[PDB]
Structure formats: C-alpha cells, structure tokens
Amino acid sequence: TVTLAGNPIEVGGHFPQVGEIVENFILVGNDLADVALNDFASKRKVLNIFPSIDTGVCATSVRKFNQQAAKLSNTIVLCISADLPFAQARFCGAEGIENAKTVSTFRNHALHSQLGVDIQTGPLAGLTSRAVIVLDEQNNVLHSQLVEEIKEEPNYEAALAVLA
Amino acid sequence: TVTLAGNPIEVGGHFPQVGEIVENFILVGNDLADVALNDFASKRKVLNIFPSIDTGVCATSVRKFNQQAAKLSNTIVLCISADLPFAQARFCGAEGIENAKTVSTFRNHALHSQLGVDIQTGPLAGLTSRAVIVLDEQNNVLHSQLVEEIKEEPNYEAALAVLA
Numbered sequence A, B: 001t002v003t004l005a006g007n008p009i010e011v012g013g014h015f016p017q018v019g020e021i022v023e024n025f026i027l028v029g030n031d032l033a034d035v036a037l038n039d040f041a042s043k044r045k046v047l048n049i050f051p052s053i054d055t056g057v058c059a060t061s062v063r064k065f066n067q068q069a070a071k072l073s074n075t076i077v078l079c080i081s082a083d084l085p086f087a088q089a090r091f092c093g094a095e096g097i098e099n100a101k102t103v104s105t106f107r108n109h110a111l112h113s114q115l116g117v118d119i120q121t122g123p124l125a126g127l128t129s130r131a132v133i134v135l136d137e138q139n140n141v142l143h144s145q146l147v148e149e150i151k152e153e154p155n156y157e158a159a160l161a162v163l164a
Helices: A061-070 A110-114 A156-163 B060-071 B110-114 B156-161
Strands: A002-004 A007-009 A026-028 A034-036 A044-049 A075-081 A100-104 A131-135 A141-146 B002-004 B007-009 B026-028 B034-036 B044-049 B075-081 B100-104 B131-135 B141-146
Touching (some): A044 A156, B060 B075, B141 B156
Parallel strands (some): B044 B075
Antiparallel strands (some): A026 A100, B026 B100, B131 B141
16 A cells, blocks of 8 residues: 555565564674664664665755654664665764664565565565664564655654654 | 685676676666666677675776777676665766666676676675676677676776777
C-alpha cells in the first residue's frame, strides 16, 4: 500500500509491529567497519530508514528529527540505507549530531526484507522503503511506521512521544 | 591473488580472460533506469570497474582514460561500481563524456562474481575489485586486467592499445 509520488510500489517482508522484538543485525559504518545492532547494548535505538540519504539537497524536517531524537536520554539514532559508506559519510542529516550515525546495508541487502522495507518494483527496487522504527534498550518495538508515501514526512512526533 | 595495501583480499568469480566472450548483463543508470550490455550491441566496450567512484579523491588520470577510450571509434565506456546511482553522478571520470556512462550493481550483486571481481573479505567486501575489461564488437575479450593492487593505477595504455 506504499506509493512513490502517488505511484504504487511493492514493499516486501514483515514490517516490525509494536511489542515485537527486532533481531540482531549487522551493517557497515562510515569507516567500512561492521556495526551490529547489539553494539549499542542497553540503549534505545531509533532506526531511521531511507531509500537514499544522498538525494542531494539535504532535508530539514529530517535533520530536525535526528537532532531531537539523539538529544534524548540514552538513545542512538541509526540512519539506515543502501547508500555505500562513502556516500553516507556525507549525509547532512546527522553530521554534527553526536548520537546520530549512518550505517549501510550494501553487503546485507537481506536486511531489507527482514525489516519489511524491501522495495521490489520501480526505479527504487533494491532500496529500503522509508520507515521509522523505535526500539527500547531490549530491542522491543516501542513504535514503528512504514510511510505510505515515500516523498511524505513521517510521523516524527509519534516516534518521539514514545521515547519519553 | 589481489591485495589491498599489501594485505591480500579474496576476490571470487572467474575473471574474463582474452579468448573468452562476456555475456549480457543488466545494471542501473544514473536515472535509475536499467542499462544492459546488449544496449550497445555491435560496438566496442570498455568495462572500467571500481571498488567505488565516490571515494572523495578523484585522479585526473581516471577521467583522462575515459575520455581517450570514449573518443575511439565505435567504443562505449562503462564505469561500473556498487555505488548507488545518486553517487555515481558525483564521479569526475564520466560526467561530460558522451560515450562514457556510469552504471550501478546495487540491484545486481550477482554481476560481481560473474565478472570475477567479487571482493568477499576485508572492509571492501561487497564491492567490485578494480579492473579494466576491453570487449570487441562481439563481446570477445581483447584485453583484461584485474589490478593486483587496488591502490595501483591500471595499465591504461594496454587497454587503449587493443582498441587502436
């Protein structure tokens, strides 16, 4: 039921629901080093998933969210996309933001389906659908949203409301 | 055996050798549209394979080679890497060159092993090893080189030599 600029797109996999537990996964950091979800043990996690964080013009609502989220107590914001570490290191949505890091799925495309954000049709096939998943320090889903429209601003407030 | 800064890296697949024919493959162009080897049937091709074309450091020698090869009669230069199309437009060796296009493997990781450039270990696992493959109008390999040292400049002269 997800669309791109109005045009329907098929997104595969099971999108995590509240109360569910997200399994450990391994991604790649800006320095090409492996970064596992459990590397942030006993910490709340915010999975900010984007088809691409290298769209050029940086956002604003996007950066605003990352800042406010990372400023919360004992929480880490993970911006996830299939962009390679080289490109993610330039992402302006989480630059001077301490508790905000970008991690790449380039050698773990299997994760896309595992998180229910696997775009399978259209020019964006092979990329992760826009989504926001909040996890507690035990990796339990406190909140999650698979944006119906890729080019649409996620319900950021709802994501923050649960973190506090 | 290929190495990176001395430390050897494992590269899977059968690297095309002179005397072999390369089969058609489909990659993704800068506009996210599919691009196939067959789209340039009856023309010579130069497959310029890079671990990444978004390293932040772009040598003028990289751009020079593309221009020289592309200026050759009935020749198309395909710069290939796992960088997403969004980043492949930030490459200094393709932008502005008529017969020099960049294409991404993000939707076709199987192509890595197919061309024997599949890096499997180290921090570059998941990327395509540095290589240059020159094909004739029949997709027969005229020259090919799997760069023994990723940080080494390919033998561009040898590649141009077979086309003129």
